[PDB]
PDB file of all heavy atoms in Angstrom:
ATOM      1  N   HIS T  35      22.808 -12.685 -34.239  1.00  0.00           N
ATOM      2  CA  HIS T  35      22.965 -11.960 -35.491  1.00  0.00           C
ATOM      3  C   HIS T  35      24.426 -11.575 -35.674  1.00  0.00           C
ATOM      4  O   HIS T  35      25.037 -10.998 -34.769  1.00  0.00           O
ATOM      5  CB  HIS T  35      22.084 -10.708 -35.514  1.00  0.00           C
ATOM      6  CG  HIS T  35      20.648 -10.967 -35.173  1.00  0.00           C
ATOM      7  ND1 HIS T  35      19.781 -11.606 -36.032  1.00  0.00           N
ATOM      8  CD2 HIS T  35      19.925 -10.658 -34.070  1.00  0.00           C
ATOM      9  CE1 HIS T  35      18.587 -11.685 -35.472  1.00  0.00           C
ATOM     10  NE2 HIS T  35      18.647 -11.117 -34.281  1.00  0.00           N
ATOM     11  N   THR T  37      26.930  -9.464 -38.247  1.00  0.00           N
ATOM     12  CA  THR T  37      26.989  -8.478 -39.314  1.00  0.00           C
ATOM     13  C   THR T  37      28.290  -8.611 -40.104  1.00  0.00           C
ATOM     14  O   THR T  37      29.301  -9.113 -39.609  1.00  0.00           O
ATOM     15  CB  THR T  37      26.870  -7.065 -38.746  1.00  0.00           C
ATOM     16  OG1 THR T  37      28.113  -6.687 -38.138  1.00  0.00           O
ATOM     17  CG2 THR T  37      25.765  -7.006 -37.702  1.00  0.00           C
ATOM     18  N   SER T  45      26.979  -2.761 -45.415  1.00  0.00           N
ATOM     19  CA  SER T  45      26.889  -3.582 -44.219  1.00  0.00           C
ATOM     20  C   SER T  45      25.604  -4.402 -44.249  1.00  0.00           C
ATOM     21  O   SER T  45      24.501  -3.856 -44.384  1.00  0.00           O
ATOM     22  CB  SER T  45      26.949  -2.707 -42.972  1.00  0.00           C
ATOM     23  OG  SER T  45      28.236  -2.124 -42.826  1.00  0.00           O
ATOM     24  N   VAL T  77      41.277  -7.818 -33.645  1.00  0.00           N
ATOM     25  CA  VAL T  77      40.570  -8.883 -34.346  1.00  0.00           C
ATOM     26  C   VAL T  77      40.699  -8.662 -35.847  1.00  0.00           C
ATOM     27  O   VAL T  77      40.497  -7.548 -36.342  1.00  0.00           O
ATOM     28  CB  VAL T  77      39.093  -8.933 -33.920  1.00  0.00           C
ATOM     29  CG1 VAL T  77      38.319  -9.931 -34.771  1.00  0.00           C
ATOM     30  CG2 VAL T  77      38.983  -9.278 -32.447  1.00  0.00           C
ATOM     31  N   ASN T  80      38.953  -9.165 -42.094  1.00  0.00           N
ATOM     32  CA  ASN T  80      38.977  -9.180 -43.550  1.00  0.00           C
ATOM     33  C   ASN T  80      38.925 -10.609 -44.071  1.00  0.00           C
ATOM     34  O   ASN T  80      39.578 -11.510 -43.534  1.00  0.00           O
ATOM     35  CB  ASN T  80      40.225  -8.470 -44.073  1.00  0.00           C
ATOM     36  CG  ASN T  80      40.284  -7.017 -43.648  1.00  0.00           C
ATOM     37  OD1 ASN T  80      39.613  -6.161 -44.225  1.00  0.00           O
ATOM     38  ND2 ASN T  80      41.089  -6.730 -42.632  1.00  0.00           N
ATOM     39  N   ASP T  84      37.807 -14.360 -38.889  1.00  0.00           N
ATOM     40  CA  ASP T  84      37.319 -14.529 -37.523  1.00  0.00           C
ATOM     41  C   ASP T  84      36.045 -15.360 -37.490  1.00  0.00           C
ATOM     42  O   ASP T  84      35.812 -16.103 -36.529  1.00  0.00           O
ATOM     43  CB  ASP T  84      37.079 -13.167 -36.874  1.00  0.00           C
ATOM     44  CG  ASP T  84      35.996 -12.374 -37.575  1.00  0.00           C
ATOM     45  OD1 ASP T  84      35.877 -12.495 -38.812  1.00  0.00           O
ATOM     46  OD2 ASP T  84      35.254 -11.641 -36.889  1.00  0.00           O
ATOM     47  N   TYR T 124      33.644 -10.972 -17.797  1.00  0.00           N
ATOM     48  CA  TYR T 124      32.456 -10.156 -17.594  1.00  0.00           C
ATOM     49  C   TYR T 124      31.239 -11.071 -17.657  1.00  0.00           C
ATOM     50  O   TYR T 124      31.029 -11.760 -18.662  1.00  0.00           O
ATOM     51  CB  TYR T 124      32.345  -9.059 -18.652  1.00  0.00           C
ATOM     52  CG  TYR T 124      33.596  -8.240 -18.884  1.00  0.00           C
ATOM     53  CD1 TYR T 124      34.027  -7.957 -20.174  1.00  0.00           C
ATOM     54  CD2 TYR T 124      34.333  -7.730 -17.823  1.00  0.00           C
ATOM     55  CE1 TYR T 124      35.158  -7.202 -20.404  1.00  0.00           C
ATOM     56  CE2 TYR T 124      35.471  -6.971 -18.044  1.00  0.00           C
ATOM     57  CZ  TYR T 124      35.878  -6.710 -19.338  1.00  0.00           C
ATOM     58  OH  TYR T 124      37.006  -5.957 -19.576  1.00  0.00           O
ATOM     59  N   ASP T 137      36.147 -18.377  -2.804  1.00  0.00           N
ATOM     60  CA  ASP T 137      36.793 -19.312  -1.888  1.00  0.00           C
ATOM     61  C   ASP T 137      37.007 -18.723  -0.499  1.00  0.00           C
ATOM     62  O   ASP T 137      37.459 -19.443   0.398  1.00  0.00           O
ATOM     63  CB  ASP T 137      38.119 -19.805  -2.482  1.00  0.00           C
ATOM     64  CG  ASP T 137      39.213 -18.745  -2.476  1.00  0.00           C
ATOM     65  OD1 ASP T 137      38.914 -17.549  -2.270  1.00  0.00           O
ATOM     66  OD2 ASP T 137      40.387 -19.118  -2.694  1.00  0.00           O
ATOM     67  N   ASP T 148      22.164  -7.787 -13.558  1.00  0.00           N
ATOM     68  CA  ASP T 148      23.334  -7.539 -12.725  1.00  0.00           C
ATOM     69  C   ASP T 148      24.597  -8.056 -13.407  1.00  0.00           C
ATOM     70  O   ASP T 148      24.560  -9.002 -14.195  1.00  0.00           O
ATOM     71  CB  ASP T 148      23.161  -8.198 -11.355  1.00  0.00           C
ATOM     72  CG  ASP T 148      22.284  -7.385 -10.424  1.00  0.00           C
ATOM     73  OD1 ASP T 148      22.153  -6.161 -10.660  1.00  0.00           O
ATOM     74  OD2 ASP T 148      21.725  -7.964  -9.467  1.00  0.00           O
ATOM     75  N   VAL T 151      32.407  -8.769 -12.644  1.00  0.00           N
ATOM     76  CA  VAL T 151      33.747  -8.702 -13.220  1.00  0.00           C
ATOM     77  C   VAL T 151      34.633  -9.625 -12.388  1.00  0.00           C
ATOM     78  O   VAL T 151      35.159  -9.232 -11.334  1.00  0.00           O
ATOM     79  CB  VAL T 151      34.303  -7.280 -13.246  1.00  0.00           C
ATOM     80  CG1 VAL T 151      35.686  -7.285 -13.849  1.00  0.00           C
ATOM     81  CG2 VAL T 151      33.376  -6.377 -14.046  1.00  0.00           C
ATOM     82  N   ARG T 153      37.890 -11.176 -11.693  1.00  0.00           N
ATOM     83  CA  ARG T 153      39.286 -10.862 -12.000  1.00  0.00           C
ATOM     84  C   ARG T 153      40.189 -12.021 -11.581  1.00  0.00           C
ATOM     85  O   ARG T 153      40.982 -11.932 -10.642  1.00  0.00           O
ATOM     86  CB  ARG T 153      39.692  -9.551 -11.326  1.00  0.00           C
ATOM     87  CG  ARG T 153      39.013  -8.322 -11.915  1.00  0.00           C
ATOM     88  CD  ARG T 153      39.293  -7.069 -11.096  1.00  0.00           C
ATOM     89  NE  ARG T 153      40.700  -6.681 -11.136  1.00  0.00           N
ATOM     90  CZ  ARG T 153      41.552  -6.845 -10.131  1.00  0.00           C
ATOM     91  NH1 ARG T 153      41.145  -7.394  -8.995  1.00  0.00           N
ATOM     92  NH2 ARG T 153      42.815  -6.459 -10.261  1.00  0.00           N
ATOM     93  N   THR T 155      39.550 -14.825 -10.134  1.00  0.00           N
ATOM     94  CA  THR T 155      39.310 -15.293  -8.778  1.00  0.00           C
ATOM     95  C   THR T 155      38.818 -16.742  -8.784  1.00  0.00           C
ATOM     96  O   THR T 155      38.373 -17.275  -9.804  1.00  0.00           O
ATOM     97  CB  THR T 155      38.297 -14.392  -8.065  1.00  0.00           C
ATOM     98  OG1 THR T 155      37.251 -14.025  -8.968  1.00  0.00           O
ATOM     99  CG2 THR T 155      38.979 -13.128  -7.561  1.00  0.00           C
ATOM    100  N   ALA T 156      38.928 -17.384  -7.625  1.00  0.00           N
ATOM    101  CA  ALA T 156      38.416 -18.733  -7.427  1.00  0.00           C
ATOM    102  C   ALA T 156      36.996 -18.639  -6.879  1.00  0.00           C
ATOM    103  O   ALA T 156      36.771 -18.015  -5.836  1.00  0.00           O
ATOM    104  CB  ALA T 156      39.320 -19.524  -6.483  1.00  0.00           C
ATOM    105  N   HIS T 180      47.012 -11.791 -17.525  1.00  0.00           N
ATOM    106  CA  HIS T 180      48.265 -12.295 -16.989  1.00  0.00           C
ATOM    107  C   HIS T 180      48.017 -13.011 -15.667  1.00  0.00           C
ATOM    108  O   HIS T 180      47.043 -12.737 -14.960  1.00  0.00           O
ATOM    109  CB  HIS T 180      49.264 -11.155 -16.797  1.00  0.00           C
ATOM    110  CG  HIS T 180      49.963 -10.750 -18.058  1.00  0.00           C
ATOM    111  ND1 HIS T 180      50.912 -11.540 -18.669  1.00  0.00           N
ATOM    112  CD2 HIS T 180      49.846  -9.640 -18.825  1.00  0.00           C
ATOM    113  CE1 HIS T 180      51.352 -10.934 -19.757  1.00  0.00           C
ATOM    114  NE2 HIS T 180      50.721  -9.779 -19.876  1.00  0.00           N
ATOM    115  N   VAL T 183      49.546 -12.673  -9.165  1.00  0.00           N
ATOM    116  CA  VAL T 183      50.636 -13.043  -8.269  1.00  0.00           C
ATOM    117  C   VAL T 183      50.417 -12.343  -6.937  1.00  0.00           C
ATOM    118  O   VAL T 183      50.369 -11.107  -6.881  1.00  0.00           O
ATOM    119  CB  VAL T 183      52.013 -12.677  -8.850  1.00  0.00           C
ATOM    120  CG1 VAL T 183      53.113 -13.413  -8.103  1.00  0.00           C
ATOM    121  CG2 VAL T 183      52.072 -12.989 -10.341  1.00  0.00           C
TER     122      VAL T 183
ATOM    123  N   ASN S  33      23.520  -3.792 -10.045  1.00  0.00           N
ATOM    124  CA  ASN S  33      24.658  -4.069  -9.181  1.00  0.00           C
ATOM    125  C   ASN S  33      25.844  -4.467 -10.047  1.00  0.00           C
ATOM    126  O   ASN S  33      25.701  -5.274 -10.971  1.00  0.00           O
ATOM    127  CB  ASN S  33      24.339  -5.187  -8.183  1.00  0.00           C
ATOM    128  CG  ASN S  33      23.621  -4.682  -6.948  1.00  0.00           C
ATOM    129  OD1 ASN S  33      23.956  -3.630  -6.406  1.00  0.00           O
ATOM    130  ND2 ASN S  33      22.637  -5.444  -6.486  1.00  0.00           N
ATOM    131  N   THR S  37      35.575  -8.514  -8.237  1.00  0.00           N
ATOM    132  CA  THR S  37      36.318  -9.417  -7.375  1.00  0.00           C
ATOM    133  C   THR S  37      37.813  -9.140  -7.471  1.00  0.00           C
ATOM    134  O   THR S  37      38.296  -8.515  -8.417  1.00  0.00           O
ATOM    135  CB  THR S  37      36.030 -10.875  -7.738  1.00  0.00           C
ATOM    136  OG1 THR S  37      36.756 -11.235  -8.918  1.00  0.00           O
ATOM    137  CG2 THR S  37      34.539 -11.079  -7.976  1.00  0.00           C
ATOM    138  N   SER S  45      40.185 -15.139  -2.609  1.00  0.00           N
ATOM    139  CA  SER S  45      39.354 -14.393  -3.543  1.00  0.00           C
ATOM    140  C   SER S  45      38.230 -13.707  -2.776  1.00  0.00           C
ATOM    141  O   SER S  45      37.461 -14.369  -2.071  1.00  0.00           O
ATOM    142  CB  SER S  45      38.790 -15.327  -4.611  1.00  0.00           C
ATOM    143  OG  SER S  45      39.766 -15.618  -5.596  1.00  0.00           O
ATOM    144  N   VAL S  77      45.146  -8.822 -20.177  1.00  0.00           N
ATOM    145  CA  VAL S  77      44.910  -7.832 -19.133  1.00  0.00           C
ATOM    146  C   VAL S  77      45.886  -8.040 -17.981  1.00  0.00           C
ATOM    147  O   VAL S  77      46.192  -9.176 -17.594  1.00  0.00           O
ATOM    148  CB  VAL S  77      43.449  -7.919 -18.656  1.00  0.00           C
ATOM    149  CG1 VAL S  77      43.182  -6.939 -17.522  1.00  0.00           C
ATOM    150  CG2 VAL S  77      42.502  -7.676 -19.820  1.00  0.00           C
ATOM    151  N   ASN S  80      47.750  -7.441 -11.667  1.00  0.00           N
ATOM    152  CA  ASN S  80      48.522  -7.364 -10.435  1.00  0.00           C
ATOM    153  C   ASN S  80      48.623  -5.925  -9.946  1.00  0.00           C
ATOM    154  O   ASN S  80      48.702  -4.978 -10.732  1.00  0.00           O
ATOM    155  CB  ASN S  80      49.915  -7.950 -10.644  1.00  0.00           C
ATOM    156  CG  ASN S  80      49.873  -9.430 -10.958  1.00  0.00           C
ATOM    157  OD1 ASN S  80      49.627 -10.255 -10.079  1.00  0.00           O
ATOM    158  ND2 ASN S  80      50.101  -9.773 -12.220  1.00  0.00           N
ATOM    159  N   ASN S  82      46.262  -4.390  -8.870  1.00  0.00           N
ATOM    160  CA  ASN S  82      44.953  -3.810  -9.169  1.00  0.00           C
ATOM    161  C   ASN S  82      45.065  -2.577 -10.062  1.00  0.00           C
ATOM    162  O   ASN S  82      44.264  -1.645  -9.954  1.00  0.00           O
ATOM    163  CB  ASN S  82      44.186  -3.477  -7.884  1.00  0.00           C
ATOM    164  CG  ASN S  82      43.849  -4.713  -7.072  1.00  0.00           C
ATOM    165  OD1 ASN S  82      43.447  -5.741  -7.619  1.00  0.00           O
ATOM    166  ND2 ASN S  82      44.018  -4.620  -5.757  1.00  0.00           N
ATOM    167  N   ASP S  84      44.465  -2.489 -13.183  1.00  0.00           N
ATOM    168  CA  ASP S  84      43.350  -2.468 -14.122  1.00  0.00           C
ATOM    169  C   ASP S  84      42.160  -1.718 -13.537  1.00  0.00           C
ATOM    170  O   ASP S  84      41.534  -0.898 -14.219  1.00  0.00           O
ATOM    171  CB  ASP S  84      42.957  -3.896 -14.504  1.00  0.00           C
ATOM    172  CG  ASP S  84      42.645  -4.757 -13.297  1.00  0.00           C
ATOM    173  OD1 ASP S  84      43.430  -4.734 -12.326  1.00  0.00           O
ATOM    174  OD2 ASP S  84      41.611  -5.455 -13.315  1.00  0.00           O
ATOM    175  N   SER S 101      39.223  -3.369 -24.189  1.00  0.00           N
ATOM    176  CA  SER S 101      37.810  -3.712 -24.123  1.00  0.00           C
ATOM    177  C   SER S 101      37.064  -2.636 -23.347  1.00  0.00           C
ATOM    178  O   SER S 101      37.633  -1.977 -22.474  1.00  0.00           O
ATOM    179  CB  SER S 101      37.591  -5.076 -23.456  1.00  0.00           C
ATOM    180  OG  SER S 101      37.786  -4.997 -22.054  1.00  0.00           O
ATOM    181  N   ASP S 137      23.514   0.093 -42.781  1.00  0.00           N
ATOM    182  CA  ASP S 137      23.536   1.132 -43.808  1.00  0.00           C
ATOM    183  C   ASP S 137      22.965   0.672 -45.145  1.00  0.00           C
ATOM    184  O   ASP S 137      22.735   1.512 -46.022  1.00  0.00           O
ATOM    185  CB  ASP S 137      24.964   1.664 -43.998  1.00  0.00           C
ATOM    186  CG  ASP S 137      25.924   0.626 -44.573  1.00  0.00           C
ATOM    187  OD1 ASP S 137      25.510  -0.523 -44.834  1.00  0.00           O
ATOM    188  OD2 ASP S 137      27.109   0.971 -44.767  1.00  0.00           O
ATOM    189  N   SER S 138      22.734  -0.627 -45.322  1.00  0.00           N
ATOM    190  CA  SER S 138      22.166  -1.162 -46.550  1.00  0.00           C
ATOM    191  C   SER S 138      20.650  -1.291 -46.496  1.00  0.00           C
ATOM    192  O   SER S 138      20.051  -1.780 -47.460  1.00  0.00           O
ATOM    193  CB  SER S 138      22.787  -2.527 -46.865  1.00  0.00           C
ATOM    194  OG  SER S 138      22.536  -3.461 -45.827  1.00  0.00           O
ATOM    195  N   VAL S 151      26.564  -9.591 -33.092  1.00  0.00           N
ATOM    196  CA  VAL S 151      27.997  -9.431 -33.308  1.00  0.00           C
ATOM    197  C   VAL S 151      28.166  -8.383 -34.397  1.00  0.00           C
ATOM    198  O   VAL S 151      27.946  -8.667 -35.581  1.00  0.00           O
ATOM    199  CB  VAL S 151      28.678 -10.749 -33.698  1.00  0.00           C
ATOM    200  CG1 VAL S 151      30.188 -10.606 -33.581  1.00  0.00           C
ATOM    201  CG2 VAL S 151      28.165 -11.882 -32.821  1.00  0.00           C
ATOM    202  N   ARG S 153      30.457  -6.401 -36.615  1.00  0.00           N
ATOM    203  CA  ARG S 153      31.822  -6.479 -37.137  1.00  0.00           C
ATOM    204  C   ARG S 153      32.121  -5.221 -37.950  1.00  0.00           C
ATOM    205  O   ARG S 153      32.090  -5.217 -39.181  1.00  0.00           O
ATOM    206  CB  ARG S 153      32.003  -7.752 -37.956  1.00  0.00           C
ATOM    207  CG  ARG S 153      32.007  -9.017 -37.110  1.00  0.00           C
ATOM    208  CD  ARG S 153      31.811 -10.265 -37.949  1.00  0.00           C
ATOM    209  NE  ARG S 153      33.035 -10.655 -38.639  1.00  0.00           N
ATOM    210  CZ  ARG S 153      33.249 -10.474 -39.938  1.00  0.00           C
ATOM    211  NH1 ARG S 153      32.317  -9.907 -40.694  1.00  0.00           N
ATOM    212  NH2 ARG S 153      34.393 -10.862 -40.483  1.00  0.00           N
ATOM    213  N   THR S 155      30.632  -2.709 -38.785  1.00  0.00           N
ATOM    214  CA  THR S 155      29.642  -2.318 -39.775  1.00  0.00           C
ATOM    215  C   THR S 155      28.974  -1.003 -39.384  1.00  0.00           C
ATOM    216  O   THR S 155      28.929  -0.621 -38.212  1.00  0.00           O
ATOM    217  CB  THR S 155      28.592  -3.419 -39.937  1.00  0.00           C
ATOM    218  OG1 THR S 155      28.176  -3.879 -38.647  1.00  0.00           O
ATOM    219  CG2 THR S 155      29.169  -4.589 -40.724  1.00  0.00           C
ATOM    220  N   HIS S 180      41.277  -4.843 -36.487  1.00  0.00           N
ATOM    221  CA  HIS S 180      42.036  -4.249 -37.573  1.00  0.00           C
ATOM    222  C   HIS S 180      41.081  -3.605 -38.575  1.00  0.00           C
ATOM    223  O   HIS S 180      39.907  -3.971 -38.680  1.00  0.00           O
ATOM    224  CB  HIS S 180      42.915  -5.298 -38.259  1.00  0.00           C
ATOM    225  CG  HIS S 180      44.167  -5.622 -37.502  1.00  0.00           C
ATOM    226  ND1 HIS S 180      44.548  -6.914 -37.212  1.00  0.00           N
ATOM    227  CD2 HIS S 180      45.124  -4.821 -36.979  1.00  0.00           C
ATOM    228  CE1 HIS S 180      45.689  -6.895 -36.545  1.00  0.00           C
ATOM    229  NE2 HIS S 180      46.061  -5.636 -36.390  1.00  0.00           N
ATOM    230  N   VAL S 183      38.946  -3.650 -44.923  1.00  0.00           N
ATOM    231  CA  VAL S 183      39.208  -3.293 -46.314  1.00  0.00           C
ATOM    232  C   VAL S 183      38.358  -4.196 -47.198  1.00  0.00           C
ATOM    233  O   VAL S 183      38.432  -5.427 -47.091  1.00  0.00           O
ATOM    234  CB  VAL S 183      40.696  -3.428 -46.671  1.00  0.00           C
ATOM    235  CG1 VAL S 183      41.029  -2.571 -47.885  1.00  0.00           C
ATOM    236  CG2 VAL S 183      41.569  -3.045 -45.486  1.00  0.00           C
TER     237      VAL S 183
END
Side-chain angles (χ1 to χ4, degrees):
Chain T
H35 309 287
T37 76
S45 292
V77 173
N80 299 282
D84 63 326
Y124 311 135
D137 72 346
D148 280 338
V151 180
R153 291 172 66 254
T155 40
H180 280 289
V183 196
Chain S
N33 276 319
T37 77
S45 282
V77 178
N80 296 286
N82 296 318
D84 55 313
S101 74
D137 66 0
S138 60
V151 194
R153 290 165 78 255
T155 46
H180 282 129
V183 202

